[PDB]
Amino acid sequence: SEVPQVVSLDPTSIPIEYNTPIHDIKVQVYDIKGGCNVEEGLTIFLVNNPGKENGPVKISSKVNDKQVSEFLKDENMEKFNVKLGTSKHFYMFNDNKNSVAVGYVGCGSVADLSEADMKRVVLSLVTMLHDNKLSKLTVVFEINVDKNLFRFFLETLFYEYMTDERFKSTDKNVNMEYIKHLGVYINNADTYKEEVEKARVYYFGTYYASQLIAAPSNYCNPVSLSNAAVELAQKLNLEYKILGVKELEELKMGAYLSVGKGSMYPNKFIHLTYKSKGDVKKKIALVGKGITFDSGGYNLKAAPGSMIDLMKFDMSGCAAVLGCAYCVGTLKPENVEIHFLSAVCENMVSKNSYRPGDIITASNGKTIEVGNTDAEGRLTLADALVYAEKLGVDYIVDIATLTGAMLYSLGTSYAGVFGNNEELINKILQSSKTSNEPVWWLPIINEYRATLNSKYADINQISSSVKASSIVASLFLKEFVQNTAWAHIDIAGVSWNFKARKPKGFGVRLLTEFVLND
Amino acid sequence: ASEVPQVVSLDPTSIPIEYNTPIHDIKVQVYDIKGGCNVEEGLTIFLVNNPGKENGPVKISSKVNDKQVSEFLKDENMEKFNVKLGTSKHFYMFNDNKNSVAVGYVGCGSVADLSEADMKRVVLSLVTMLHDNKLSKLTVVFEINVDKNLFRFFLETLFYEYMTDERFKSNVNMEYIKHLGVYINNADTYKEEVEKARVYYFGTYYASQLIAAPSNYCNPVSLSNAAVELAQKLNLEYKILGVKELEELKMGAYLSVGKGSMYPNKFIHLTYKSKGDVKKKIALVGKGITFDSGGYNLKAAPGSMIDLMKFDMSGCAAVLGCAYCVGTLKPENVEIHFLSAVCENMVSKNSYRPGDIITASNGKTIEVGNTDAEGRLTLADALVYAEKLGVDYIVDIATLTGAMLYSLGTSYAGVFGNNEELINKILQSSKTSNEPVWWLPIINEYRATLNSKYADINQISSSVKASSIVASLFLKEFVQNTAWAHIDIAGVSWNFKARKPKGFGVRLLTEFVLND
Amino acid sequence: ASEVPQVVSLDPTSIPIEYNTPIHDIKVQVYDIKGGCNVEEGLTIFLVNNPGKENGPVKISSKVNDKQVSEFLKDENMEKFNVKLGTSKHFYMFNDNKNSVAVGYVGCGSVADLSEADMKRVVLSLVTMLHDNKLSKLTVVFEINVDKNLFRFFLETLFYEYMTDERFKSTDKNVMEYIKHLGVYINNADTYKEEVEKARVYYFGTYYASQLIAAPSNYCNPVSLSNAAVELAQKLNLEYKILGVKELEELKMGAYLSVGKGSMYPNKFIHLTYKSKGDVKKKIALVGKGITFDSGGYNLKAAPGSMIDLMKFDMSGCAAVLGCAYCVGTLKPENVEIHFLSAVCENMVSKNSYRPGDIITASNGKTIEVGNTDAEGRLTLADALVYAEKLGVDYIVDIATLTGAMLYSLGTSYAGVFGNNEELINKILQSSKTSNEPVWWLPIINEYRATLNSKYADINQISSSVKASSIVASLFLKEFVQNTAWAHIDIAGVSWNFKARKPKGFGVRLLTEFVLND
Numbered sequence A: 001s002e003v004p005q006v007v008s009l010d011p012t013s014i015p016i017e018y019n020t021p022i023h024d025i026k027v028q029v030y031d032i033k034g035g036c037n038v039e040e041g042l043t044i045f046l047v048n049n050p051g052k053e054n055g056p057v058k059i060s061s062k063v064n065d066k067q068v069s070e071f072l073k074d075e076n077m078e079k080f081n082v083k084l085g086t087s088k089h090f091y092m093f094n095d096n097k098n099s100v101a102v103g104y105v106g107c108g109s110v111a112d113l114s115e116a117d118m119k120r121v122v123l124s125l126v127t128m129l130h131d132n133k134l135s136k137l138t139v140v141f142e143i144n145v146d147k148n149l150f151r152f153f154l155e156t157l158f159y160e161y162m163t164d165e166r167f168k169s170t171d172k173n174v175n176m177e178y179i180k181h182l183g184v185y186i187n188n189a190d191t192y193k194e195e196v197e198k199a200r201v202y203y204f205g206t207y208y209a210s211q212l213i214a215a216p217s218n219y220c221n222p223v224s225l226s227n228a229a230v231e232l233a234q235k236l237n238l239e240y241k242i243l244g245v246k247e248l249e250e251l252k253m254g255a256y257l258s259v260g261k262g263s264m265y266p267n268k269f270i271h272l273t274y275k276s277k278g279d280v281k282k283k284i285a286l287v288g289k290g291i292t293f294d295s296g297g298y299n300l301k302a303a304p305g306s307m308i309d310l311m312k313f314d315m316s317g318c319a320a321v322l323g324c325a326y327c328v329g330t331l332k333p334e335n336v337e338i339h340f341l342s343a344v345c346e347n348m349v350s351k352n353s354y355r356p357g358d359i360i361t362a363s364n365g366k367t368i369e370v371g372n373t374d375a376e377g378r379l380t381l382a383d384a385l386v387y388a389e390k391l392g393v394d395y396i397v398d399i400a401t402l403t404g405a406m407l408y409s410l411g412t413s414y415a416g417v418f419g420n421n422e423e424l425i426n427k428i429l430q431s432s433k434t435s436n437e438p439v440w441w442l443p444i445i446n447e448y449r450a451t452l453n454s455k456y457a458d459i460n461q462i463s464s465s466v467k468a469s470s471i472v473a474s475l476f477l478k479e480f481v482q483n484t485a486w487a488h489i490d491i492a493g494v495s496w497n498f499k500a501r502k503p504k505g506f507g508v509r510l511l512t513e514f515v516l517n518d
Numbered sequence B: 001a002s003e004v005p006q007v008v009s010l011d012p013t014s015i016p017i018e019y020n021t022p023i024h025d026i027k028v029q030v031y032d033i034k035g036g037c038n039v040e041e042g043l044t045i046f047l048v049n050n051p052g053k054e055n056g057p058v059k060i061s062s063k064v065n066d067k068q069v070s071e072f073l074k075d076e077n078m079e080k081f082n083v084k085l086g087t088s089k090h091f092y093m094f095n096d097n098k099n100s101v102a103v104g105y106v107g108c109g110s111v112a113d114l115s116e117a118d119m120k121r122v123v124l125s126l127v128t129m130l131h132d133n134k135l136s137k138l139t140v141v142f143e144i145n146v147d148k149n150l151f152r153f154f155l156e157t158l159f160y161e162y163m164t165d166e167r168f169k170s171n172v173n174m175e176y177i178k179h180l181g182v183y184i185n186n187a188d189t190y191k192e193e194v195e196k197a198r199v200y201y202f203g204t205y206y207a208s209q210l211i212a213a214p215s216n217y218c219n220p221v222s223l224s225n226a227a228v229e230l231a232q233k234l235n236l237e238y239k240i241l242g243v244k245e246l247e248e249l250k251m252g253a254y255l256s257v258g259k260g261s262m263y264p265n266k267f268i269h270l271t272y273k274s275k276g277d278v279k280k281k282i283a284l285v286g287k288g289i290t291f292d293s294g295g296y297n298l299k300a301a302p303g304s305m306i307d308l309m310k311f312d313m314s315g316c317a318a319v320l321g322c323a324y325c326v327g328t329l330k331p332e333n334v335e336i337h338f339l340s341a342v343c344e345n346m347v348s349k350n351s352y353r354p355g356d357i358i359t360a361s362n363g364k365t366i367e368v369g370n371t372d373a374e375g376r377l378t379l380a381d382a383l384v385y386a387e388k389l390g391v392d393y394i395v396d397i398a399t400l401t402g403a404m405l406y407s408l409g410t411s412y413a414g415v416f417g418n419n420e421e422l423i424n425k426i427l428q429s430s431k432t433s434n435e436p437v438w439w440l441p442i443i444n445e446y447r448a449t450l451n452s453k454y455a456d457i458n459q460i461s462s463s464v465k466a467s468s469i470v471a472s473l474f475l476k477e478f479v480q481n482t483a484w485a486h487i488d489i490a491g492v493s494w495n496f497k498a499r500k501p502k503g504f505g506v507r508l509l510t511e512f513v514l515n516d
Numbered sequence C: 001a002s003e004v005p006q007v008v009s010l011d012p013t014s015i016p017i018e019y020n021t022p023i024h025d026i027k028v029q030v031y032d033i034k035g036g037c038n039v040e041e042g043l044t045i046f047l048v049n050n051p052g053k054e055n056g057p058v059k060i061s062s063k064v065n066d067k068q069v070s071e072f073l074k075d076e077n078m079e080k081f082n083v084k085l086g087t088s089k090h091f092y093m094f095n096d097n098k099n100s101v102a103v104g105y106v107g108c109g110s111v112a113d114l115s116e117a118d119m120k121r122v123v124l125s126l127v128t129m130l131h132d133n134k135l136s137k138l139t140v141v142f143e144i145n146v147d148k149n150l151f152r153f154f155l156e157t158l159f160y161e162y163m164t165d166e167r168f169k170s171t172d173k174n175v176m177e178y179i180k181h182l183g184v185y186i187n188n189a190d191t192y193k194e195e196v197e198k199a200r201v202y203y204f205g206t207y208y209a210s211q212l213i214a215a216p217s218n219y220c221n222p223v224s225l226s227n228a229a230v231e232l233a234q235k236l237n238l239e240y241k242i243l244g245v246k247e248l249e250e251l252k253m254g255a256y257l258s259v260g261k262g263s264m265y266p267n268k269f270i271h272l273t274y275k276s277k278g279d280v281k282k283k284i285a286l287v288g289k290g291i292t293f294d295s296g297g298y299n300l301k302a303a304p305g306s307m308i309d310l311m312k313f314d315m316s317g318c319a320a321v322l323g324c325a326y327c328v329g330t331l332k333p334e335n336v337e338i339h340f341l342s343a344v345c346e347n348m349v350s351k352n353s354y355r356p357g358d359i360i361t362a363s364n365g366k367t368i369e370v371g372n373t374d375a376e377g378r379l380t381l382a383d384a385l386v387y388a389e390k391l392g393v394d395y396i397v398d399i400a401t402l403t404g405a406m407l408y409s410l411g412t413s414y415a416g417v418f419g420n421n422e423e424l425i426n427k428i429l430q431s432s433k434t435s436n437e438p439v440w441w442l443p444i445i446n447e448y449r450a451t452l453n454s455k456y457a458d459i460n461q462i463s464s465s466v467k468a469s470s471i472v473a474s475l476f477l478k479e480f481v482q483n484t485a486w487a488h489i490d491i492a493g494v495s496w497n498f499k500a501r502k503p504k505g506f507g508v509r510l511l512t513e514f515v516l517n518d
Ligand SMILES: CC(C)C[C@H](NC(=O)[C@@H](O)[C@H](N)Cc1ccccc1)C(=O)O
Pocket: A294, A306, A307, A314, A372, A374, A375, A376, A377, A401, A402, A403, A404, A405, A462, A469, A492, A493
């Protein structure tokens, strides 16, 4: 419970914003066949031109205003093109003689937008919202989108529009004002209406994970992160328990505890549970790596390219799992019981730290020879997986910023999924599709298992000879699931948006769609 | 033949090649295990497992036709030994006729389905005995369960691992066997795999010979000479394009790479055509860099492995190895073009430079960001050449990106492509050849990193570290409207532990051509 | 016996040590070859060579007391096999009593005197025949010439390589049975019999050192390692004193204390004494470097190739000295008093650690400017050498994993010896010859002395200019011995068997032969 401090100025909680400005936006959806009213604020058309690379803009909607309809005639629009992510603003007086702003974002010439294309559209729309004090946005869909992509549009709009100012003090943006109303016109509106508040929920799970990830290691440490998790559980009425060191010692969690030895913050293992009222048909454990700062330990992140300054993000797994708890707790699916687990700790340099070469004993009795203190995530996950399997679940899914090698294999757009069960992997791939968080299935190559044979311990933490480190880490984790369907999502390459200098909150919507689909 | 230039008169002017190998003299017989075993002669090895009982005892069930060997094989003696994968024992003894025989076993663990990796460990253990034996016959008794493809793989791997390459040396511990007996259940169905294995073995071994051949022996001229000689022996159509023809074709990307080399570029084009109607045309394109120094981007960083870079023509060797198999097995209804833009990547006053803008044969200008990304430059022009042939499929195979070691490692190659059906055919070939491959994505979001400020395209990304995916995006720019796949064998081509090539890809490509 | 401090309750509080090993249960019988060999149960291996003829044929020359086995081993049958060094074959047949027997040979090549390295190769071949074969007995027939020392070395090596250290195995023990009996046939057997128990003692001292070296730094820390030394003294009836920090401060051991400042484990200085019951004619101090983990300190081992993961091995000098104590205490030489010393500590990174640049005062009052916290071994040895000279001994010999440069100079096979006294160096070289643990004499080059001149302190810990780091270390140590014959053995290159992934226990037999032959 109490966060230790070195000096009185050290923070004792993570600041967390629950009621965000996005939550105050009144959203209305209307059917496009009634025509568009253009009365105030900004009205943006989403337009493409199938076939025609950089083709002309042609506004097809009925617009219920003579002045605006006149402005938007093909002749007047012909100067402009649909190049993806392109946009323009128009200014005019409507029939009520009130000035309005109108514009468009180009959605290109391929009639089915990828998740990345749609994100490009949303970013252009967001630049129209920034540096312009507007009370209302209206979006007219003149493109084709399924229900999941419409929801993705809104989630992405909400998340990209929201600006995280929790750590601003003298430099808050004096000009940021958020719209209070969002109008949407789309064909077959009634079927899209359900997606609006689901988007709002998914936006918040994602933005909540993001807040946790962006919070630096002096704010977000094992104690404050587990305290935040308790507060979340209380707000959603989830069952919760936080296991402290004495309980962890009783459970013989020697791999997890060795990692956190050198830290000033005691280890805290988070265990939240959602249980549907009614028959429980699937039981699922979701396990998130929760290293609140990864210095590397005695194998210090000192090599060029090791990104030590980014390592507050090494609890992104735990944050995805807590974001997922927010969504599941809010949407209340039937027929399931979900355990949201994270072994939280910090990997530090101290007289008290574990050392390279140390032999430690995991909670399932396996001895492990530590070959590199910087492979700490798999040690904490090892004990968390053992704990998960004891719960008697149908599926165990872990999510973790586990290996830097992901940047060289899949890069920054797709997460890797590994697993011991093809049906579970397919469920995750399915969830990747409907969440629009991209994942690619990678193999657990058993030929490399022999490189984890230790001369002294039961197993080596790291390979001597294999450089395929994401596969080797999956081989190691596999040793801590005995007989349960298990998949492991490595988000090391996708978690942080290096270009925008912010978290993605990657995996919240993926894991939630996984729970919901099941 | 073109003459190979020499700096001194001691410089070699051809690659030595062994066509006739001791493996070719092995008479192979397959017998049904249901009849019991004849152990009267030579070295007999039982392949044995113990399901469930991990590292459990050896127990041999087969009846054998010798009372002395029966005694040796009794449960009480055999239980002194265990089945741990690759563990072996063998003993010399006298049979009923007082003739020297030897008898032993290789442990096959306690899992009934052996993977190709597992089967490799079994074979290595068998080969260790063979490299220290001298008896005229080996008999292998399968008391384990393998499918037809895995049985073929066993044979191929046995032949390949048993054969030792002594071309560059100037045992009194062994002699090559003249006979191989195999006892296995349903022997009749397995018999047809034998000569197929012997063909796949030599395709693989031939590729290996070319890869292991050092870069003073195997240069663009001697390698293309070797391909002409292979084509002649197989009756394939062949054409070697030299520098003047290559300039006429405007192959600026490929020619730029070889500018620094004393050896003129040579583009190998062999063709197999079926005697009956052609229903399918395929181009197989192999990366053919006979030595990759890196160029001005010299391989000087720790772990860059410049000492290994004679292996950078592994894709070319795999294609030529495939041409041996195809030219030998003679598939019907197919026309296959075997292609390689061969050159050497060197440091010279004459070399291309980082920064150069060069023009590929399809008109695209390319800004060179790194002279050690030379493979994709030579493949760009080879791909444009392939597409102009009007084929149904283009498959390229190349030691293209060091990043493979960090994504899939040393066991599985990666495949990328623009066509799902073709990728699935490659995956299926991978399953039947037992040369493992994994599908990796061409991620279009990374394509913008290849937008050059000056040229039509960048050779490399400044930002994206997913270099195998970026390389594939680059190559995809050189295939306009044909099903195409790219196999990156950088991680998988060289066997680091054994200090020798794998010949990776021969069987994969041959299976592709034969079964599709 | 001090309490081992723990960070968590799962931290181990002692080093596990096996004293009664399966090798100790083996009954050894030596027979003279003139009586013929009896060939019965187990496995009977002939060691055969063929002088002149590289890879020449096997010919078995011993009389075998069995007609069937004699027929089997006749020249005609054996000539199809060759003597290539390390090569081996197994034979199966029925003896004259109709009982199946296993026989075989190991090739010993064509050179009539085997080097220590060649013999190791023969033994490794023999061990592979023992492994994965449930045998009650092994019989070895020598048809090669070995002197008494080489015979003993054969047995020591056999025992050492055969013994498998499973102390840290839990779930992965080798489901491994040992022979109960070892028969040896050799010419002039009566003359070799005395080597058998000597070999068995030397095996254990070596294996004991090996157990200490392989024990990871969480098990083997300065408190637990000094407790193990106490236990060993109690078992052997050696005197002992363990000096703790209060006594070390009183003795002004500032160099040694500074190295340990960063550790959570208090320094412990080990002092064991063996004294012969008769008139003492020689007094000897053996000093071993005792760093239980070397992180480098603030000069962290982060450089590629710094092998931080192997640094549990930095107490290998101390282990060799304690292995020597075992042998000496067991064999009980006369007319000698031996002091076994080690300044044990751990070199860590902490708010409390010593710093690059710190100036510290050794117990002989010399001030030392610290140039690199990773040159910590010579600082601990400085103080241990001052203590040792105060004892009033005739010879001081230290042994230490002191400099990585040994790998570039002598490599992994030979240790280097440096000293201030040629008579003593020659004694060490003679011990090397009779122990078969190779050492080469290296110079202390006075010309480099000047590069240890400190602008501020009395001396520099390290050279800024000279890259010959092993010689520089020796020069520095020389300054802490005023008037006594001293030698220094640098075992950094030789201690760890990199290929086999285990210690050699190097130095035990060398130091024991030194003591015995004096
Ligand atoms: C020691 C290695 C085998 C494993 C090591 N893994 C780690 O450091 C993880 O604990 C890192 N948190 C993973 C990471 C590294 C760089 C960027 C993003 C994420 C890695 O270097 O990838």
